Amino acid sequence: GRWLDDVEKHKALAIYPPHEGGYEGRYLNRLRYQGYYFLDLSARGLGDPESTLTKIHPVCPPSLGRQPVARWYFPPEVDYRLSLLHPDAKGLIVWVYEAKRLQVLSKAELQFLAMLPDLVRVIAECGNWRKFIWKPLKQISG
Amino acid sequence: GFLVFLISSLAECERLPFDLPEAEEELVAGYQTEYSGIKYGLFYLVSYLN
Amino acid sequence: TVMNLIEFPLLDQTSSNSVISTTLNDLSNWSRLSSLWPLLYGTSCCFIEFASLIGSRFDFDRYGLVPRSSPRQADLILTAGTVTMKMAPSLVRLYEQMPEPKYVIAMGACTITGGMFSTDSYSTVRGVDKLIPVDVYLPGCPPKPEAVIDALTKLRKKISREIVEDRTLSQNKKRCFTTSHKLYVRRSTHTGTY
Amino acid sequence: KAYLFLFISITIRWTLPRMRMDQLLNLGWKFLLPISLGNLLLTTSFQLV
Amino acid sequence: YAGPLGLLQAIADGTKLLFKEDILPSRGDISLFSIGPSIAVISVLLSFLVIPLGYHFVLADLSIGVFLWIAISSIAPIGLLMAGYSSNNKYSFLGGLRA
Amino acid sequence: MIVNMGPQHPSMHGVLRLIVTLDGEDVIDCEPILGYLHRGMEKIAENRTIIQYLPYVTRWDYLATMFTEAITVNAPEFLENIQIPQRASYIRVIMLELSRIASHLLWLGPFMADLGAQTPFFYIFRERELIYDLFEAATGMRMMHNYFRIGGVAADLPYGWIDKCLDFCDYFLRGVVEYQQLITQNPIFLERVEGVGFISGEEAVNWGLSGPMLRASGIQWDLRKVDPYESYNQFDWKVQWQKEGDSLARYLVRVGEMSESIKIIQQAIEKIPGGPYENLEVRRFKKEKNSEWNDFEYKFLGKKPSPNFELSRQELYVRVEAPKGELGIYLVGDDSLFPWRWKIRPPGFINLQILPQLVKKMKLADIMTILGSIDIIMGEVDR
Amino acid sequence: PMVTGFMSYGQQTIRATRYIGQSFITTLSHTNRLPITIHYPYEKSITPERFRGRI
Amino acid sequence: LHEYDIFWTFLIIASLIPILAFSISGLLAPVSEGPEKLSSYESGIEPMGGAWVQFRIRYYMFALVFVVFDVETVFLYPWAMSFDVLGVSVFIEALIFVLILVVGLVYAWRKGALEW
Amino acid sequence: QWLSCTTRHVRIYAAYIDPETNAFDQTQTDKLTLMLDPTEEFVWTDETCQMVYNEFQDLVDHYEGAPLSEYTLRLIGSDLEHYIRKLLYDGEIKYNMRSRVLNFSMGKPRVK
Amino acid sequence: MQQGWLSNWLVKHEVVHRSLGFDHRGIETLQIKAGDWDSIAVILYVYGYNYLRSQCAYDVAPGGSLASVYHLTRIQYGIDNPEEVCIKVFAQKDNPRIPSVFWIWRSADFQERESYDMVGISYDNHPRLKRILMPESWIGWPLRKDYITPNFYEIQDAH
Amino acid sequence: YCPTSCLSMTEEYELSTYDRHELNYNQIALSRLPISIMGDYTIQTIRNSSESKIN
């Protein structure tokens, strides 16, 4: 478990692969057999990510040209997915794919998404050198 | 004799079975439509081997 | 007080496989994703640039994208061009008549919603996923000729995210129901004569 | 040597519109057969020595 | 993108085609479907016998060698007609009949 | 005995179902099934304003990509006489005579890929690449969408556009003769295309056909003369036609016309009142005060553009011809801003009326050649 | 007759060859041309100052 | 003409090859596709029905003339092998032989047999 | 022939197919069978589908007097596409929950 | 409102058309009898008329009857603004059938065919009188400004 | 026609849409300082036909 060398301990990291993805899926395959279960997000689009990982946040649906205020008041995706998770599960493995009144998901927002691992095992995504590398994003954060 | 052999060799190994990258093998495909997996693989093989 | 909650994960998902029996299917799916072939289909306002994907401006054939004009052979189809009510009752036949490793995607913002055909008209279908289950939705009318390659690169990872036990989630059952009719037949209307 | 013919066929693939099977039979029957017989008729006396 | 160049792309397409869930359509079955391409592949595979490659590298002297090659070259059309007729619909019946 | 030629339609222009009888190898009767791409624009065209309706035209029109906006701007600007300057008119002439090329390529290339020319498919795309940069840098994303506002055009085309034809402008000229020497070469090219789908002129005008497909019978019914469209006719030209009308005549008439495109472009770039755009750019800074510049001449916009304008009863028709075929938008002159009824008259809908009467006692290959040479596309047909 | 055929059978073949070999040696400079087409996906096209993307 | 044992081994091996490939495909395959699966492809119309699509009238003549003109070769081969071995009588005999079928082909050419 | 409205999760087949394979894709089209969502967009327990099976007679016998045209097929599919929407809007049925793309034709869940 | 050149040539035959006045765009308009759409078609080509124009549908008002329109022109080598002739014939929802020119000149094989489904008025003198635009499955006649546009889930407010 | 330069243009496209309902583009993160073709360290884009020099 070479990923296991830098996921269980750190719980905060970013994947720096070549910009093709044809070498990284094998890593994700191995992390379905401990208690880690996938949550891909593609972070681009949401506001302050706190209310996207802890609070009931009204996600305004794609509007249909008409109908003034109509927002279905969507729920968060942490405690409910825990409720669906079995009591036998190590961590929530989550991928912030797009880590590269809105709120810019800057490095401060990633630090604030590096606390839910401590206080969801999140990994940021950003393409990089031909060799698949990983690096703690918290030190890159700020 | 070599001229005849060379020109015949084309159609003998199915060259060309379809005239154009868009035009089909004269109906929709060369009798290998339903042949999906190892079947079309074997036909690709036999063509290259001819 | 949640509306339409998600079903519970029935299995505990607790297992462990050997590497000598897992890397086989791993590289198998690697080849399955790195050898995909397109399936020809294109109708309307979100299609034409697909042709430019074969030339010196965009070349997706550089990755082995062999364009096959037949359902039973290929596995990748692009629902390019805005689809209407008709040409759909024969479109889904394509998805029904190809091998199981399809992993179809979408293309054209007018195919994920029906963008410029969404005020009032009894022809256009609202999105494609209400007809066929696909994976990725592609924006743009016309769709950005580079965004399609980026979305192909995106989908290229989902197949790599598959394991040996995943080759059982394509097996089907039959909810075949026994119910008859009582009505009158209609002779063929599409009479082929001039 | 066979690679040379592989390349020749590859090139010819993009130089001629392959005929339809209304001309292909004509070419195969009324064109290649007479000369492919005549070359043998010639080589008979050619190898007569 | 299949490595440096497509040196692995060919066998990659081969392995992909390997699984591809052979469908075996309804009209016509294993009675002639699987029997079709076997004749096709054997007609050209067996021809490799008398083909030489270099000074004393022939697989069989076989004084009837090129004759055997000509004889085995005219067995494929049987398999092509069988395959093209192993189904029922058009685009395969005439599609194979033409060839 | 009868099979369909496939809604998958292994052809150029999309989806066409052709149900046809089959006596083993030859066919007896074929029939087309149309209506699978209903853009239903005739409905929305009443429930909309003009500017919100402007980008709608190059949607069911992506092959022509420009022959839909001519009439779509005739109704707002040419009807109520919001005087279009002759300089902006020459700009629109540059546009139209480049769309002639945009059609010539996107037919001949695929026509080459239908007739039997297997290699030049990517060649014509490599030639066309420059028109992409032009349409992008002129007004819009890729199809140059929204190049026609009401009071003129969107914005005068930038400086790196007009005076910068020269590259393709003399490249394609020497490139044309390539196709002309290739077509007469390898008569297998010519043998299969000659003597198929022949049509006469009296039936070409009796069936309602148009375009170079009709001009190829000595008819010369080229509607680039009969209309004072934006007072374009100051330029000179040469009628393109033939005297047979068949598929080979179609190829000849559609290869002999694009030579006039760059000719008209050369007429314009030096005959436009502003000429090149960088010329007018460097001229409006020495005479900023007052001149013929920015006057009734040399102005992109005459009055304010806005979705508010009333109309009187005036139901005018224009038979604006595209190198694919004619086009017309008749419309009941209504007193309201948006009008009562809309209507379109596309060439594709006025082309396949002869289609089942073209392929008579032929084979599947003959049908393929005729349908590849006829220069037909969907999108225009259904509307 | 046949004398006309015995005179034209070489003419048909010589026309076929004069076209085939001519096109062959003409496309010779095409099969081994010196143009470089679109590069890898890391070499996107240049974009001038009038387009539309994400508003 | 000494040992065709290599020929027999190659026969059995290359005949096991296709069934081996089919069985290997079958082992690692999906037990799935209970869909319609009763219609072939490139026919998005879900069509069905039809017969009497033959046009054998034309191709049958080609097949016949080929079947008749083929027997020439398997007689020429024993002659083509025994030219120098024997004298020049076999030359004249085979010339008469081939010329008979040349006349036959001339006849089949004049009267319309080899057509569209 | 077998001209049926084969929309997603709504396939009112105008022909008898309730074998593993219909053996003709129509079986002479004398039964008008139906299969429910082969893509497993919804997981089915028999009791939940029992109301749909009961109202099938309400849709095939109670309000059918028109010949075998897809007009009636849309007349069926219209209410078919909303019976499921009602059965979900009151929480009795839920989505796929498998290893597919897990698409949301009706959007993500809500908080009522 | 007065007669036309066609009437100028035709009055000598004592069979007059429906003499209507000018159009709005700047040209004239005429009219022919509905049930007598064949006489005009057989006399116009004798005068030299062989090209149609403006094959469109119509409605009288929102909540009104139906109609049809036919403009006409010719093709000649030396031509200078061929005469602009227009016909606009009205017809009722009851017995909505007008003759067709398909059998006199063959320029409208599919032109009138779209109106065979588009609006609620069919026409004889045209084989294959069936739907093309709208699916054959559908039965209704759309595009009438008073027609009940299908108030299904896919048009009105769906939230 | 917007009063003060509000509605503008950009140009990227990595819309990894796994569902339609994930497209709420509010005020500022729309900026995101996008790809910046010239600001990348793996890009050297030569100008195309109509943007390069003559000949």
Automatic annotation (TrEMBL), chain C:
<dbReference type="GO" id="GO:0051539">
    <property type="term" value="F:4 iron, 4 sulfur cluster binding"/>
</dbReference>
<feature type="domain" description="NADH:ubiquinone oxidoreductase-like 20kDa subunit">
    <location>
        <begin position="45"/>
        <end position="155"/>
    </location>
</feature>
<comment type="subunit">
    <text>NDH is composed of at least 16 different subunits, 5 of which are encoded in the nucleus.</text>
</comment>
<keyword id="KW-0479">Metal-binding</keyword>
<comment type="similarity">
    <text>Belongs to the complex I 20 kDa subunit family.</text>
</comment>
<dbReference type="GO" id="GO:0005506">
    <property type="term" value="F:iron ion binding"/>
</dbReference>
<feature type="binding site">
    <location>
        <position position="46"/>
    </location>
    <ligand>
        <name>[4Fe-4S] cluster</name>
    </ligand>
</feature>
<keyword id="KW-0520">NAD</keyword>
<keyword id="KW-0150">Chloroplast</keyword>
<keyword id="KW-0934">Plastid</keyword>
<dbReference type="GO" id="GO:0045271">
    <property type="term" value="C:respiratory chain complex I"/>
</dbReference>
<dbReference type="GO" id="GO:0019684">
    <property type="term" value="P:photosynthesis, light reaction"/>
</dbReference>
TrEMBL record, chain F:
<dbReference type="GO" id="GO:0016655">
    <property type="term" value="F:oxidoreductase activity, acting on NAD(P)H, quinone or similar compound as acceptor"/>
</dbReference>
<dbReference type="GO" id="GO:0019684">
    <property type="term" value="P:photosynthesis, light reaction"/>
</dbReference>
<keyword id="KW-0618">Plastoquinone</keyword>
<keyword id="KW-0874">Quinone</keyword>
<comment type="function">
    <text>NDH shuttles electrons from NAD(P)H:plastoquinone, via FMN and iron-sulfur (Fe-S) centers, to quinones in the photosynthetic chain and possibly in a chloroplast respiratory chain. The immediate electron acceptor for the enzyme in this species is believed to be plastoquinone. Couples the redox reaction to proton translocation, and thus conserves the redox energy in a proton gradient.</text>
</comment>
<protein>
    <recommendedName>
        <fullName>NAD(P)H-quinone oxidoreductase subunit H, chloroplastic</fullName>
        <ecNumber>7.1.1.-</ecNumber>
    </recommendedName>
</protein>
<dbReference type="InterPro" id="IPR029014">
    <property type="entry name" value="NiFe-Hase_large"/>
</dbReference>
<keyword id="KW-0934">Plastid</keyword>
<keyword id="KW-0813">Transport</keyword>
<keyword id="KW-0472">Membrane</keyword>
<keyword id="KW-0521">NADP</keyword>
<keyword id="KW-0520">NAD</keyword>
Automatic annotation (TrEMBL), chain I:
<comment type="subunit">
    <text>Part of the chloroplast NDH complex, composed of a mixture of chloroplast and nucleus encoded subunits. Component of the NDH subcomplex A, at least composed of ndhH, ndhI, ndhJ, ndhK, ndhL, ndhM, ndhN and ndhO.</text>
</comment>
<comment type="function">
    <text>NDH shuttles electrons from NAD(P)H:plastoquinone, via FMN and iron-sulfur (Fe-S) centers, to quinones in the photosynthetic chain and possibly in a chloroplast respiratory chain. The immediate electron acceptor for the enzyme in this species is believed to be plastoquinone. Couples the redox reaction to proton translocation, and thus conserves the redox energy in a proton gradient.</text>
</comment>
<keyword id="KW-1278">Translocase</keyword>
<dbReference type="GO" id="GO:0009535">
    <property type="term" value="C:chloroplast thylakoid membrane"/>
</dbReference>
<dbReference type="GO" id="GO:0016655">
    <property type="term" value="F:oxidoreductase activity, acting on NAD(P)H, quinone or similar compound as acceptor"/>
</dbReference>
<keyword id="KW-0520">NAD</keyword>
<keyword id="KW-0874">Quinone</keyword>
<protein>
    <recommendedName>
        <fullName>NAD(P)H-quinone oxidoreductase subunit M, chloroplastic</fullName>
    </recommendedName>
</protein>
<keyword id="KW-0618">Plastoquinone</keyword>
<comment type="similarity">
    <text>Belongs to the NDH complex subunit M family.</text>
</comment>
<keyword id="KW-0472">Membrane</keyword>
<keyword id="KW-0521">NADP</keyword>
Automatic annotation (TrEMBL), chain K:
<comment type="subunit">
    <text>NDH is composed of at least 16 different subunits, 5 of which are encoded in the nucleus.</text>
</comment>
<comment type="similarity">
    <text>Belongs to the complex I 23 kDa subunit family.</text>
</comment>
<feature type="binding site">
    <location>
        <position position="2"/>
    </location>
    <ligand>
        <name>[4Fe-4S] cluster 1</name>
    </ligand>
</feature>
<comment type="function">
    <text>NDH shuttles electrons from NAD(P)H:plastoquinone, via FMN and iron-sulfur (Fe-S) centers, to quinones in the photosynthetic chain and possibly in a chloroplast respiratory chain. The immediate electron acceptor for the enzyme in this species is believed to be plastoquinone. Couples the redox reaction to proton translocation, and thus conserves the redox energy in a proton gradient.</text>
</comment>
<protein>
    <recommendedName>
        <fullName>NAD(P)H-quinone oxidoreductase subunit I, chloroplastic</fullName>
    </recommendedName>
</protein>
